Structures are given as C-alpha cells and as structure tokens.
Scaffold this active site. Structure first.
Site, PDB file in Angstrom:
ATOM      1  N   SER A   1       0.726  -1.751  -0.168  1.00 41.44           N
ATOM      2  CA  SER A   1      -0.145  -0.406   0.131  1.00 41.44           C
ATOM      3  C   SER A   1       0.698   1.008   0.076  1.00 41.44           C
ATOM      4  CB  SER A   1      -0.924   0.071   1.226  1.00 41.44           C
ATOM      5  OG  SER A   1      -2.236  -0.925   1.274  1.00 41.44           O
TER       6      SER A   1
ATOM      7  N   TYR B   1     -10.861   2.762   4.523  1.00 42.77           N
ATOM      8  CA  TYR B   1     -10.044   2.450   3.605  1.00 42.77           C
ATOM      9  C   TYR B   1     -10.013   1.351   3.216  1.00 42.77           C
ATOM     10  CZ  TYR B   1      -4.696   1.059   2.679  1.00 42.77           C
ATOM     11  OH  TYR B   1      -3.196   1.762   1.689  1.00 42.77           O
TER      12      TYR B   1
ATOM     13  N   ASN C   1      -8.329  -0.596  -1.198  1.00 45.44           N
ATOM     14  CA  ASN C   1      -7.402  -0.823  -2.225  1.00 45.44           C
ATOM     15  C   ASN C   1      -8.769  -0.531  -3.781  1.00 45.44           C
ATOM     16  OD1 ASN C   1      -5.610  -1.862  -1.636  1.00 45.44           O
ATOM     17  ND2 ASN C   1      -6.271  -2.622  -0.694  1.00 45.44           N
TER      18      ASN C   1
ATOM     19  N   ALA D   1       1.157  -3.540   3.337  1.00 47.18           N
ATOM     20  CA  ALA D   1       1.608  -4.294   3.032  1.00 47.18           C
ATOM     21  C   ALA D   1       1.898  -5.458   2.301  1.00 47.18           C
ATOM     22  CB  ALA D   1       1.116  -5.292   4.208  1.00 47.18           C
TER      23      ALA D   1
ATOM     24  N   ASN E   1       5.442  -9.461   6.180  1.00 48.82           N
ATOM     25  CA  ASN E   1       4.800  -8.529   6.608  1.00 48.82           C
ATOM     26  C   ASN E   1       4.102  -8.696   7.875  1.00 48.82           C
ATOM     27  OD1 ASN E   1       2.070  -7.565   7.346  1.00 48.82           O
ATOM     28  ND2 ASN E   1       0.795  -8.575   6.340  1.00 48.82           N
TER      29      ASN E   1
HETATM   30  C1  LIG Z   1      -1.113  -2.743   2.105  1.00 46.81           C
HETATM   31  C2  LIG Z   1      -2.570  -2.826   2.596  1.00 46.81           C
HETATM   32  C3  LIG Z   1      -1.823  -2.176   3.957  1.00 46.81           C
HETATM   33  O1  LIG Z   1      -1.199  -3.227   4.871  1.00 46.81           O
HETATM   34  O2  LIG Z   1      -2.090  -1.096   4.347  1.00 46.81           O
HETATM   35  N1  LIG Z   1      -2.585  -4.544   2.369  1.00 46.81           N
HETATM   36  C4  LIG Z   1      -2.484  -5.713   2.339  1.00 46.81           C
HETATM   37  O3  LIG Z   1      -2.370  -5.917   3.670  1.00 46.81           O
HETATM   38  C5  LIG Z   1      -2.804  -5.859   1.531  1.00 46.81           C
HETATM   39  C6  LIG Z   1      -3.423  -7.353   0.619  1.00 46.81           C
HETATM   40  C7  LIG Z   1      -2.560  -7.708  -0.533  1.00 46.81           C
HETATM   41  C8  LIG Z   1      -3.912  -5.863  -2.081  1.00 46.81           C
HETATM   42  C9  LIG Z   1      -4.119  -5.877  -0.416  1.00 46.81           C
HETATM   43  C10 LIG Z   1      -4.638  -7.122   0.215  1.00 46.81           C
HETATM   44  C11 LIG Z   1      -3.809  -5.343   0.329  1.00 46.81           C
HETATM   45  C12 LIG Z   1      -3.189  -4.056   1.480  1.00 46.81           C
HETATM   46  O4  LIG Z   1      -4.654  -3.517   0.950  1.00 46.81           O
END
Ligand SMILES: C[C@H](C(=O)O)N1C(=O)[C@@H]2[C@H]3CC[C@H](C3)[C@@H]2C1=O
Ligand SMILES: C[C@H](C(=O)O)N1C(=O)[C@@H]2[C@@H]3CC[C@@H](C3)[C@@H]2C1=O
EC number: 3.5.2.6
Length: 358
Positions: free
Chosen positions: A61, A147, A149, A315, A340
């Site tokens: 992210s 939040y 995606n 992550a 992670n």
């Molecule tokens: C980076 C972000 C976060 O930690 O803020 N996040 C995830 O863990 C990954 C996994 C893969 C795409 C989505 C789920 C993504 C997400 O929103």
C-alpha cells in the site's frame, strides 16, 4: 555515517527483527536531506541471498503514495479535476448511487464505503464494471472514510484516462523517470529478478498475486535507494524541475479530510508535528483492523503543511513496509521488510529513530 544515525538505527531495528522474526530488512534514514542506508538478513533464505541496497521489496500500500502523486500530476497538467464526477471518465458507470461521487471521494476513501479489496472473482474489465455498478454505498459521499483498494485503485485507473497512457506507462514516464527511480517497478522485469526478494508468510516464500487494480493500489516494487529518493522528492518538492510533478507532490500532501488527529492526503496521510507517539502508534489508517470513521471536510483543502508527520504503511502477504517524513526538519525514514509484521511495531521503531534524530 554519523554515529548518532548508526546507533539509533541499529539499536532499534536489531531487536525489531529478532522479535518479529524478520528474514530481511532494508532501512534508509534521510538526515538533513542526505540518505543513510542499512541492511540485514536475507532477500532469499533458500538461495542465501543477502539484502542489499539493490534488493527489490513489495511496497504493498505504500504504492498508494505514487498513485496519489501521479494523480496530482494529472491535476497539475489540467487533465483531471478532483471535483470531476467519477462518471466523467467512466460514462458506463450509469448506476444512480454514483451521482455525487467525485474523483476526490475515490482518491480519499470517502465514496461511501467502497470495499477494502476488489473481489478475486473480478478477472475481466466487464467484471470490474459489473462490480462498481452493483456496489451499494452505506453512506452519502464525503461523510465517512473507509480505507479501500477499490477506491484509490479506481482513482488511479481514471486519473490517467485523458493522457491515453496505461497506468504503468504514465507512472514510468511521469513519475519514475523524472525522479530517476530506475529500480522501481509495477512489473518486475526479467533483468531485475535476481534482486527481487522473496516475501515470507508462515515460512513459505511468496510474491504478490495479480489482481484487478493491483498496480494502482498495492503493486509497486522498489529498492531502498529508490525509496530514499522518493522520500527526498516528497520532503522538498520544490527541488523538482518538472513543474506538474512538483505541483502533484504538493497536492498529494494537501489536507482534504480530518478524522481524529489524522488528515487524509492523496495516498499520503498526515498528522501535525509534534505528534503524540501514541496517536500514530495507536493509530490509523485503517484502524487495522478495519475502521469506518466519520470525516470532517477541510473546505478548502489546506496546502501541504511543513510541520507534519507524513506517512504511509504498506503490506502484501509476504512484505511489510513503512515510510515517514517531517518536511520542516528535512528528516525521513524508509523501512522495507520481507515479512508482513504488525503496523504498530513499524510506527514505533520509525518514531524511536526520527525522534532521536530531530
Ligand atoms: C498494504 C495494505 C496495508 O497493510 O495497509 N494491504 C495489505 O495487507 C495487502 C493485501 C494485498 C492487497 C491488499 C490485501 C493489500 C492491502 O490493502
Ligand atoms: C544505467 C546504469 C549504468 O551503469 O549506466 N545502471 C546499470 O549499469 C544497470 C546495471 C548496473 C547497475 C543497475 C544494474 C542499473 C544501473 O543503474
């Protein structure tokens, strides 16, 4: 390297790695504008490949900051406006709930409860249209932050439509190249595969899997050097020779919404410096896990505030990343890991390091 920098980094990161069982890690500290680099452990356990300053990590992210800036660049180019209806750039989105939903809402997760992920079932363009057409909001636009995606992902895809460039071409030509981020990739090319670290999830070697709007939301891979240069570019956007890009960076650190002590930017999120530890360690953005929060509109958006903690956590299944900087102090940090591990741990360590150095 200044011993102060050496000591605070090592003393903070070493126990972090031990306690979190992090296979490999890269850290950059930007101090008075200058980058200082630190690496530990393995990019590839099986092949005994160490982490180097040239190792590629999945940013997850933290990719959203690039998306925000590319978006701001398109605004600066006069190609899009954040006040534009979403439907201006996707006229097939005829479903009524979309009336009143602007590019600003998409960019800032305030569209009315777009979900965190696009479903894995969405595997074509017609699928994606169906998904967005059929989505029913829980809230009116610009009232709550969730939040998502699927929210900024869509912003990213639409922001580049006027250019006629693909998201990746536009990112490469308009952001990566001008900033000389020559080892930053949406898709890792065969020439770079030797440098691409494996991520580790429950002991298995993993890389991010393809998905709809992945580039736009979580798909950038980068090295510690390029990420330090990304921080420098965002710390002092006035040093940048391409006007629209400099303006795009500024727009991305503008404050559009407030929830609690946090301000929503484009990709970037901000708190007033000095910060309560505490209020960040704690905090945001997200609520991880996962937090619908009422927003107060900042009308009009406050320009980028120098006295801010500007940050983004990121992550994937096998990677954990964090970036934070304080423009007023010319001070920043990048932490890239191929596991992670919990967000509060990253924020704590970044706080420990930056507090000691300011
Ligand atoms: C980076 C972000 C976060 O930690 O803020 N996040 C995830 O863990 C990954 C996994 C893969 C795409 C989505 C789920 C993504 C997400 O929103
Ligand atoms: C363009 C520049 C150069 O040497 O001119 N350069 C390379 O050599 C490729 C290879 C050697 C280092 C890295 C891989 C990448 C780079 O920065």
């Amino acid at each position: 390297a200044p011993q102060q920098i050496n000591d605070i980094v090592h003393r903070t990161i070493t126990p972090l790695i031990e306690q979190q069982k992090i296979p490999g890690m890269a850290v950059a500290v930007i101090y008075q504008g200058k980058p200082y680099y630190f690496t530990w452990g393995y990019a590839d356990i099986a092949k005994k490949q160490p982490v180097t300053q040239q190792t590629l990590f999945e940013l997850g992210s933290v990719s959203k900051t690039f998306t925000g800036v590319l978006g701001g660049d398109a605004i600066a180019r006069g190609e899009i406006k954040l006040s534009d209806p979403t439907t201006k750039y996707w006229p097939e989105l005829t479903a009524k709930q979309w009336n009143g939903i602007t590019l600003l809402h998409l960019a800032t997760y305030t569209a009315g409860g777009l979900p965190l992920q696009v479903p894995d079932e969405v595997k074509s363009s017609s699928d994606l249209l169906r998904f967005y057409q059929n989505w029913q909001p829980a809230w009116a636009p610009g009232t709550q932050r969730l939040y998502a995606n699927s929210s900024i992902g869509l912003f990213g895809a639409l922001a580049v439509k006027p250019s006629g460039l693909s998201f990746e071409q536009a990112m490469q030509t308009r952001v990566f190249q001008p900033l000389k981020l020559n080892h930053t990739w949406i898709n890792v090319p065969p020439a770079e595969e030797k440098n691409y670290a494996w991520g580790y999830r429950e002991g298995k070697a993993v890389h991010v899997s393809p998905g709809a709007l992945d580039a736009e939301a979580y798909g950038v891979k980068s090295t510690i050097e390029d990420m330090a240069r990304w921080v420098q570019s965002n710390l002092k956007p006035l040093d940048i020779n391409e006007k629209t890009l400099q303006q795009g960076i500024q727009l991305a650190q503008s404050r559009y919404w407030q929830t609690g002590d946090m301000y929503q930017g484009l990709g970037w999120e901000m708190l007033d410096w000095p910060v309560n530890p505490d209020s960040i360690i704690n905090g945001s953005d997200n609520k991880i896990a996962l937090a619908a929060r009422p927003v107060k509109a900042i009308t009009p958006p406050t320009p980028a505030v120098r006295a801010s903690w500007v940050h983004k956590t990121g992550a994937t299944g096998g990677f954990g990343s964090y970036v934070a900087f304080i423009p007023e102090k010319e001070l920043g940090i990048v932490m890239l890991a191929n596991k992670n591990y919990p967000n509060p741990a990253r924020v704590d360590a970044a706080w420990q390091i930056l507090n000691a150095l300011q």
